[PDB]
């Protein structure tokens, strides 16, 4: 039921993910600026330069449909997941408490921007504690715990 609440606001999110991927980077890095750090890239844009930075938007985008196709699997997500999981934790070194950040960021983007409520807001948190507690338990299997 929580990832049909979800899916019940995503059309906001889904319309324009180069916006809203946007969107959510920038606060990501505005509120967490370690954050910025963990992307090679992106590490070292002046804060006022990120908003209007296609690059951003366009990772952005591609983090938003990712988890789009996670929602629109509704918990049955292994083949998504562990790559995900294999890649953020062999590659890209993201420490897990990186992704309750960036989660946290896109429930408030996703009230002002996609009227997700009250009841929503808790449904979002809730799949991505789902989804984090999938991505810990494969760090651990790779020996990252
Ligand atoms: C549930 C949340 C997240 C989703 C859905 C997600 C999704 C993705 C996807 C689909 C890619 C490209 C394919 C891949 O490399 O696996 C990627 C790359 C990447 N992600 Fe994530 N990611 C998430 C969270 C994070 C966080 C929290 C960080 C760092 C704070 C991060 C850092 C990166 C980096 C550095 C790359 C590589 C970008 C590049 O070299 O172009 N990701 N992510």
Redesign the pocket.
Same mark, same amino acid.
């Given at each position: 039921a929580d990832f049909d609440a979800v899916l019940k606001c995503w059309g906001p999110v889904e319309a324009d993910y180069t916006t809203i991927g946007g969107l959510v980077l920038t606060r990501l890095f505005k509120e967490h600026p370690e954050?910025q750090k963990?992307?090679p =890239?992106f590490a070292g844009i002046a804060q006022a330069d990120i908003a209007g930075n296609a690059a951003v938007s366009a990772?952005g985008a591609?983090?938003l449909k =990712?988890?789009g196709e996670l929602l629109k699997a509704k918990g049955s997500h292994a083949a998504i997941l562990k790559?995900?999981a294999n890649?953020?934790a062999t =590659?890209?070194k !993201?420490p897990i408490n990186?992704?309750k950040? !960036?989660?946290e960021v896109l429930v408030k983007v996703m009230q002002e921007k996609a009227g997700l409520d009250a009841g929503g807001q808790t449904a979002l948190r809730n799949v991505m504690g789902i !989804?984090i507690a999938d991505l810990e338990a494969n760090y651990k299997e790779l020996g990252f715990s």
């Open positions: 954050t963990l992307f =890239k990772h591609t983090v =990712k988890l790559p995900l890649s953020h =590659k890209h !993201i990186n992704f950040l !960036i989660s !989804i």
